[PDB]
Amino acid sequence: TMMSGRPGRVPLQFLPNEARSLPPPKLTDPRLVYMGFLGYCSGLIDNAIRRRPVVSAGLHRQLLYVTSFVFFGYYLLKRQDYMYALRDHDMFAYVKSHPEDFPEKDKKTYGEILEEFHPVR
Amino acid sequence: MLKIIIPTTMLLPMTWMSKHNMIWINATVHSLLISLISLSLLNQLGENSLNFSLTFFSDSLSAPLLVLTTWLLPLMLMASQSHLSKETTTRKKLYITMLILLQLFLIMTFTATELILFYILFEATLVPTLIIITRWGNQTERLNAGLYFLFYTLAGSLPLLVALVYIQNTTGSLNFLIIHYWSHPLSNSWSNIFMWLACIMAFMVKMPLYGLHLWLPKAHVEAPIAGSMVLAAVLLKLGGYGMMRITTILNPLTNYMAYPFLMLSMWGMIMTSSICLRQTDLKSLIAYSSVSHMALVIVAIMIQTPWSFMGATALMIAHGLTSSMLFCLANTNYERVHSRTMILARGLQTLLPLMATWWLVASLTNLALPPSINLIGELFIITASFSWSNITIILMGMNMMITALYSLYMLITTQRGKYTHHINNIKPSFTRENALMALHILPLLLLTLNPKMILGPLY
Amino acid sequence: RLQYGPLAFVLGERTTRKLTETSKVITVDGNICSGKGRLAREIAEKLGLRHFPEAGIHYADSTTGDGKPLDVQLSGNCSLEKFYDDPKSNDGNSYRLQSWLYASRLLQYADALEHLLSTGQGVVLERSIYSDFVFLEAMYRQGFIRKQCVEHYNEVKKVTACEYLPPHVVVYVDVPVPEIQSRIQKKGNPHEMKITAAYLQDIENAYKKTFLPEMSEKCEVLQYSAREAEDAEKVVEDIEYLKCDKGPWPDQDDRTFHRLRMLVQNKLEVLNYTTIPVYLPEITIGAHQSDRVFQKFTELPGRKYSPGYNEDVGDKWIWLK
Amino acid sequence: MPLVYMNIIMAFAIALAGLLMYRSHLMSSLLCLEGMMLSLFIMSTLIILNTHFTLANMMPIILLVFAACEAALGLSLLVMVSNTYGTDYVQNLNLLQC
Amino acid sequence: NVLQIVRDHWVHILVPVGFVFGCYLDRRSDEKLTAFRNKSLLFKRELRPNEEVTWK
Amino acid sequence: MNPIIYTTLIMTVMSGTMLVMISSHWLLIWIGFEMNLLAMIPVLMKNFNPRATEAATKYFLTQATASMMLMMAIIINLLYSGQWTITKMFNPVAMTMMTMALAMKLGLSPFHFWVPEVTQGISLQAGLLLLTWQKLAPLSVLCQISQSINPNLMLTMAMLSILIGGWGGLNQTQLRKIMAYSSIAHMGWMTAVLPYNTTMTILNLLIYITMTLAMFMLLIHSSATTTLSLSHTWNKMPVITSLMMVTLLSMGGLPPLSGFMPKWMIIQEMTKNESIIMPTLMAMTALLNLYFYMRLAYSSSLTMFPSTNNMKMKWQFEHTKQMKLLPTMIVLSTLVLPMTPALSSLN
Amino acid sequence: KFYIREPPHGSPDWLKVGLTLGTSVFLWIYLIKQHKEDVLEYKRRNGLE
Ligand SMILES: CCCCCCCCCCCCCCCCCC(=O)OC[C@H](COP(=O)([O-])OCC(O)COP(=O)([O-])OC[C@@H](COC(=O)CCCCCCCCCCCCCCCCC)OC(=O)CCCCCCCCCCCCCCCCC)OC(=O)CCCCCCCCCCCCCCCCC
Ligand SMILES: CCCCCCCCCCCCCCCCC[C@@H](O)O[C@H](CO[C@H](O)CCCCCCCCCCCCCCC)COP(=O)(O)OCC[N+](C)(C)C
Ligand SMILES: CCCCCCCCCCCCCCCCCC(=O)OC[C@H](COP(=O)(O)OCCN)OC(=O)CCCCCCCCCCCCCCCCC
Numbered sequence A: 001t002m003m004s005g006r007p008g009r010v011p012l013q014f015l016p017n018e019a020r021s022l023p024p025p026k027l028t029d030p031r032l033v034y035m036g037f038l039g040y041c042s043g044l045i046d047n048a049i050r051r052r053p054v055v056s057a058g059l060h061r062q063l064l065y066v067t068s069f070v071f072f073g074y075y076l077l078k079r080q081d082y083m084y085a086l087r088d089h090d091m092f093a094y095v096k097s098h099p100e101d102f103p104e105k106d107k108k109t110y111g112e113i114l115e116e117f118h119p120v121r
Numbered sequence B: 001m002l003k004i005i006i007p008t009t010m011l012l013p014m015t016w017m018s019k020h021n022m023i024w025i026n027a028t029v030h031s032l033l034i035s036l037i038s039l040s041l042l043n044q045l046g047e048n049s050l051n052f053s054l055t056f057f058s059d060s061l062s063a064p065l066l067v068l069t070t071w072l073l074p075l076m077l078m079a080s081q082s083h084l085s086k087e088t089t090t091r092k093k094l095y096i097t098m099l100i101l102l103q104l105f106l107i108m109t110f111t112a113t114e115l116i117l118f119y120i121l122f123e124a125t126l127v128p129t130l131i132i133i134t135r136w137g138n139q140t141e142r143l144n145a146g147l148y149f150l151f152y153t154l155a156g157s158l159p160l161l162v163a164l165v166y167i168q169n170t171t172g173s174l175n176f177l178i179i180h181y182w183s184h185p186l187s188n189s190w191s192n193i194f195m196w197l198a199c200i201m202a203f204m205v206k207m208p209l210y211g212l213h214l215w216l217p218k219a220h221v222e223a224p225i226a227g228s229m230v231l232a233a234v235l236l237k238l239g240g241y242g243m244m245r246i247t248t249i250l251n252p253l254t255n256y257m258a259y260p261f262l263m264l265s266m267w268g269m270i271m272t273s274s275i276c277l278r279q280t281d282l283k284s285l286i287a288y289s290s291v292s293h294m295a296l297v298i299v300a301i302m303i304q305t306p307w308s309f310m311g312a313t314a315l316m317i318a319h320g321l322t323s324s325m326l327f328c329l330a331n332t333n334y335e336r337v338h339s340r341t342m343i344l345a346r347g348l349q350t351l352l353p354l355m356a357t358w359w360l361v362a363s364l365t366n367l368a369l370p371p372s373i374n375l376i377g378e379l380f381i382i383t384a385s386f387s388w389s390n391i392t393i394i395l396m397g398m399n400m401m402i403t404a405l406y407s408l409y410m411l412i413t414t415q416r417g418k419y420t421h422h423i424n425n426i427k428p429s430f431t432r433e434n435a436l437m438a439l440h441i442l443p444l445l446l447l448t449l450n451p452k453m454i455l456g457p458l459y
Numbered sequence C: 001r002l003q004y005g006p007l008a009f010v011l012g013e014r015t016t017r018k019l020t021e022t023s024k025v026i027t028v029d030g031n032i033c034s035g036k037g038r039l040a041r042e043i044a045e046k047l048g049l050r051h052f053p054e055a056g057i058h059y060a061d062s063t064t065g066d067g068k069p070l071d072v073q074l075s076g077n078c079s080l081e082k083f084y085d086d087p088k089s090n091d092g093n094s095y096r097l098q099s100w101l102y103a104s105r106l107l108q109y110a111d112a113l114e115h116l117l118s119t120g121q122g123v124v125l126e127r128s129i130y131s132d133f134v135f136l137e138a139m140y141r142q143g144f145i146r147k148q149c150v151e152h153y154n155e156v157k158k159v160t161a162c163e164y165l166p167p168h169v170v171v172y173v174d175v176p177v178p179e180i181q182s183r184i185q186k187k188g189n190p191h192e193m194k195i196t197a198a199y200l201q202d203i204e205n206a207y208k209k210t211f212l213p214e215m216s217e218k219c220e221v222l223q224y225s226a227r228e229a230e231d232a233e234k235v236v237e238d239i240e241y242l243k244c245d246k247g248p249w250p251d252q253d254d255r256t257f258h259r260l261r262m263l264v265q266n267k268l269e270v271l272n273y274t275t276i277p278v279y280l281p282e283i284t285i286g287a288h289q290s291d292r293v294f295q296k297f298t299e300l301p302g303r304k305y306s307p308g309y310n311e312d313v314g315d316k317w318i319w320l321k
Numbered sequence D: 001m002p003l004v005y006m007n008i009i010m011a012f013a014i015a016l017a018g019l020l021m022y023r024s025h026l027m028s029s030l031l032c033l034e035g036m037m038l039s040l041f042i043m044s045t046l047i048i049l050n051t052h053f054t055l056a057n058m059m060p061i062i063l064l065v066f067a068a069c070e071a072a073l074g075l076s077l078l079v080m081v082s083n084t085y086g087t088d089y090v091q092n093l094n095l096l097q098c
Numbered sequence E: 001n002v003l004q005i006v007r008d009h010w011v012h013i014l015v016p017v018g019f020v021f022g023c024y025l026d027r028r029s030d031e032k033l034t035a036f037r038n039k040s041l042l043f044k045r046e047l048r049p050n051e052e053v054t055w056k
Numbered sequence F: 001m002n003p004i005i006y007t008t009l010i011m012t013v014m015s016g017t018m019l020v021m022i023s024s025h026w027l028l029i030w031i032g033f034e035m036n037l038l039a040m041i042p043v044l045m046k047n048f049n050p051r052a053t054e055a056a057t058k059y060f061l062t063q064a065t066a067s068m069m070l071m072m073a074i075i076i077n078l079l080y081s082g083q084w085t086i087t088k089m090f091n092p093v094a095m096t097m098m099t100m101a102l103a104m105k106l107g108l109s110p111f112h113f114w115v116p117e118v119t120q121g122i123s124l125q126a127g128l129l130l131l132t133w134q135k136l137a138p139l140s141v142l143c144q145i146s147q148s149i150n151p152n153l154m155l156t157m158a159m160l161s162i163l164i165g166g167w168g169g170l171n172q173t174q175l176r177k178i179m180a181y182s183s184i185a186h187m188g189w190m191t192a193v194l195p196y197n198t199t200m201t202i203l204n205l206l207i208y209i210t211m212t213l214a215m216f217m218l219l220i221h222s223s224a225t226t227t228l229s230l231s232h233t234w235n236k237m238p239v240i241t242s243l244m245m246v247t248l249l250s251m252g253g254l255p256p257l258s259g260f261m262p263k264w265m266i267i268q269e270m271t272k273n274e275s276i277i278m279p280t281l282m283a284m285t286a287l288l289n290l291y292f293y294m295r296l297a298y299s300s301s302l303t304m305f306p307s308t309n310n311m312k313m314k315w316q317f318e319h320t321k322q323m324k325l326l327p328t329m330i331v332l333s334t335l336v337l338p339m340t341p342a343l344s345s346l347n
Numbered sequence G: 001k002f003y004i005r006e007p008p009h010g011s012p013d014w015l016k017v018g019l020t021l022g023t024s025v026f027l028w029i030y031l032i033k034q035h036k037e038d039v040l041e042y043k044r045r046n047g048l049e
């Protein structure tokens, strides 16, 4: 477990307060559109299994499918973005606080670097 | 690439929402329009690739393959509408959906800029093909053919997935541009040998290599006509494209690891041509000819010179077109007499003249007849192999002689002689079949007219 | 609630509460061309119970969609007239008819049990799945069907009828075979005029030797002759004064009734084992014919979708349903 | 560790080996299963009493409670098997195969 | 009538509008990669008096 | 069984699992295991027949032995540390005992035979609940105690589970035994990734649970418990067979379906830890699972088997009970590959 | 009338239809409000607007 037991972590909290400082996902997010597509597919499959007209029947039910998927997808995307931002924050903090473990290296040009040549023949 | 990708994902709902008798018309018209749109990818640069976005890019190697796929879809639609007359509307739409999904996956495969996305898409291409084969095949052996095809491909490709994730962990990226610019030599070690083996073996199984090719006759003979067309024209070119893409990071280990594969390719090219000489099934003959041509392509990619890559690209395009046309001709014959035996139907020149002309032109393109792009690619590969060594000319000459022998043997057996007396249901050739043959053959001649469009980035 | 289920059960709907001690299952039985149908009509109308005529072919057609019978090619694929004309067919018509009739009787018994458990009103059936086997034995002893067909019938009957409650009253009408043949000749229908005397005798032997001895142990059995069956007043009086507490119905409880009602209200679970993968040439249908006939059935007018979602039969508000 | 702990752990091991090696009767294996919990109870109370973990003295009683719950479950399954077959032999539990 | 023609031939706009939407999304993807616009050493130049960006 | 008693037994099973997953005390975790088993036995014996009774007996014996070993491990750990909190275990012997007990509870090889035996013995609803929930709990305990897991023992049992599941599923014709061997193989994959990334373990658990729920609910909808019984479903409701086919393709790990995501992520994570031989063997061995999934797909949807004559009456009648969340489980088990980076949210 | 028995879904369950539409509308308006508040809080915390 990498980020389990992280200091200051409140248990059973889907989205902490520190996540409010990150940019929320746009409503036209391609991931949100894909979640809505999944909801629409679920509605179509529901109509197919219940032997209703797949495309025409149950418009309210299909709309509820799409809406529920979009809602949960928006919150899931918020949590995913928060976790990735937290990972980057921790990585940068560790790199900064361990300079002897992460030292800068002198940059040499390819005019100085000697690379062996392997002819293709 | 979205201007081409989205119209396919719109072909899907159009197919599912069109009327029962209009599905073929709508699909054919809009597939032809999408092919015309995709013709704009041929305008490539001399320095680098066309980098549309972070996810998709096009090159002088990807563009002809994409154009070939987009052109191949409507021909498959024509053949499928030929052999699926009594099907239900839902199953017709499902077959069209499988073809559309396959085309979409192939487009995204050829334009994918990362190796892992390329792996995902080129493995996703298996599901529609397996469904098509094992569902709309005519004979019992379709199930075994599908099992062989699927398991050969997957047993080849899983070590490729492991190698790709390992390479990402080691180098930081699987992006093709980054791995090309940041490439480092591969030292002679067991670990590097097995990484090279994983990648090359995946794509060799896809090619297929000699000794790893039984699934090809199994699937090609037992698949429906559209499945046979897509399997030979495009799905065999994923291996060559992948090998021409991965070999950037496999040097200088390709100088020493290519010997067994080169020997297998050359000797199995000879052996599969000889097998073509003694085939009692027409589809099997076409499949083994495909095996020989792809073995020549493997030789080109393994010798890995700028003259070999151009020949490999030209031969891949030419073989795709020619093999698709041959499968279509054999399928028309099968739809006549309901049997794949070559010697069952004879005198087809005196019974169907214009189909005899189509057979003649297809056979002349199958063998390297100048100035066809088939001969252009084969001659470039032979010249590169000659620079590699001077007995490859002996092997290539033997292969060319046997190729001409079996091509003209097929032509003379099917078309010449006297007709079978008791076969009296050979109706005159349809306008649809004639148009299918014309659309197969004319672009090949136009490509012969303009050959720099299919010679790859090394041109 | 709004539909029977575990929620209704925990809410408090109880079959014992619903019953009124007049909720009885009465099955009238007899040989071919008896007065059993008229006797069942009279008993049902005098006792105020619901009458269920004999479940022949197209009973499921009568209970589903519109009540009109469907095509024989789509519902049953068997012919009683063809069985009479050529009993020893080479296409398995005899056993196809027998198995289809058993399935129809199973469906009718499930419907009757559902009606009794949901309304409390008794039901009078013109025949049951417990009396159906007599025609199977009559066919078998006459060489009309095969031992494999008999074994498949026995397997299906076991796994299906083992789950239901036997009738309260079994009323058998005994008529001699010469009288049966005289009535058949008087009726004048040619196909049943082709019935032989041995076939009629086998049915009576199966009734006398197996069905009646088997039903006697379970509950009361009433036997009447032609004259006795003609006077239904005495039959109803005899039924009304039957004392019996040895049947499984007194042993049934609310939970057992709940399980039985959940079973009988599900018509696909009733017919679950009527189609088991036993490949007899009589009853097995090939893939191509199965696909074609299924396509035709789906092309039937009110059969493409669920009952509430068929626009071509005048169903509206589909987009909000 | 003293030899008393060794003896209790050996008793648990013996009772475990007995359960894993059936002979004919399910009741005998149920008795072997009951003995394992007796050894667990003895070991736990010996450990707790020696370390003066005062609040842990209630754990062995809960152990006994769930022990006899398991014993009740085993007895119920045994009576169902015996009703089905006439004997509590484990050889009759062979309808299901791997 | 005219209604039936639209009722049946309305699927013929799906692929064209998909092509239009694909071109639009290609423009959207291109406009996110403008961090080296008029900054490459090869193609760097001074803007004309009546232009804001070198390309779009 | 009264519906109130059945729902209270389900509530008690869930209460035992939740007690295991919320407790910080080894005694309370053991109590949760005991409560789960006690309320789970009658669920297995709900539909009374000799097969159900035998399955319940075997399940009870296996789980009782595992609980005895688990409590012995707890006591041995307490002896050398005096600690009741569930953390890294302080004694290697106690850790080995706990690992073997939890592997036996899960069904990891060589403790697997009871899984096909019980799954065949019990009905479809019982098998669904068994597989899903009874894998849910011990995996939680293992994830909590992962940092003391012996990698050699865990990976050995995982690879054995993968191989044995593949071979058993190859041989079986019964759908419940096929599902049991599939469960064994998936548990092998999960426990193989466990000593490296509990997040990947949880991801594989979620995807496996979704696919298993979809498959079991499809089987309940079709009322088919054998291969030939499933071969008749194309003639009554062909949509269910197609959905089952795509679900089977997903469970085999074929891209671009949901079943490829756990295998892909696990292979990547194990490669990050310089493991190549194990990922390659695990990837190659799953082709057996794919083969018998494909064999099942041939019989049900890709080909048309012969049917019977009462199927016409079955046509005339309509399915009454509605499966809850079946379309959602079918969609989530096939079309969530583009949503892979949500495992960070799962973290 | 076509069916011999009144179908269970003969007429729309208006209670279920109204609840479905209301739930969809409520979820959409709640999502819009949540997104607006999230954008405002992000701007306020980062000192953008
Ligand atoms: C649309 C493209 C989708 C691509 C994939 C995307 C993901 C999946 C889609 C979601 C699920 C869709 C519904 C599934 C069930 C469909 C059932 C059916 O009959 O459907 C017919 C139905 C119309 O018929 P109907 O009158 O309602 O009822 C007739 C009966 O159903 C007649 O039924 P029947 O009784 O005749 O049933 C028999 C039939 C029953 O067969 C089926 O029901 C087939 C479909 C179900 C199988 C599984 C579907 C996929 C589920 C997810 C799995 C992964 C998918 C991706 C896989 C990739 C790799 C392969 O079985 C067979 O024929 C058996 C032989 C074949 C078996 C072997 C082949 C199996 C292939 C499995 C994979 C298929 C992938 C694509 C599926 C596309 C489905 C439309 O049409 C559709 O459902 C079309 C799709 C919805 C279109 C919406 C259009 C909206 C308006 C235009 C929008 C334009 C774009 C918007 C943007 C703005 C533009 C301006
Ligand atoms: C103050 C007043 C307002 C309070 C507001 C409420 C505060 C939050 C309340 C949360 C609900 C109450 C508790 C209910 C149970 C909590 C469940 C959840 O919230 O907890 C989080 C858990 O969240 C879930 O894990 C994320 C669900 C993600 C679902 C998708 C998984 C990703 C699948 C990848 C493919 C995606 C496909 C697309 C899916 C549709 C983190 O809890 P944590 O204590 O730390 O977990 C410990 C175990 N760990 C550490 C190993 C994780
Ligand atoms: C957090 C909630 C989880 C789900 C809880 C409820 C589960 C049981 C109920 C759903 C059963 C299957 C759906 C189809 C039902 C068909 C029968 C019918 O007519 O249903 C009508 C119903 C709308 O009824 P209504 O009461 O208005 O619903 C809103 C709440 N009052 O129509 C519907 O309900 C159809 C739309 C359902 C929504 C899709 C399913 C939930 C998806 C939530 C988003 C997350 C997706 C991933 C889920 C797993 C991970 C969390």
Ligand SMILES: Nc1ncnc2c1ncn2[C@@H]1O[C@H](COP(=O)(O)OP(=O)(O)O)[C@@H](O)[C@H]1O
Binding pocket: C031, C032, C033, C034, C035, C036, C037, C038, C054, C056, C080, C097, C098, C101, C132, C135, C136, C192
């Ligand atoms: N299981 C069966 N097998 C063959 N024929 C049957 C079966 N059950 C009923 N029949 C036929 O259906 C008809 C039932 O009517 P019947 O018993 O003569 O009473 P009624 O004279 O009142 O119509 C008979 O002609 C009988 O031959």
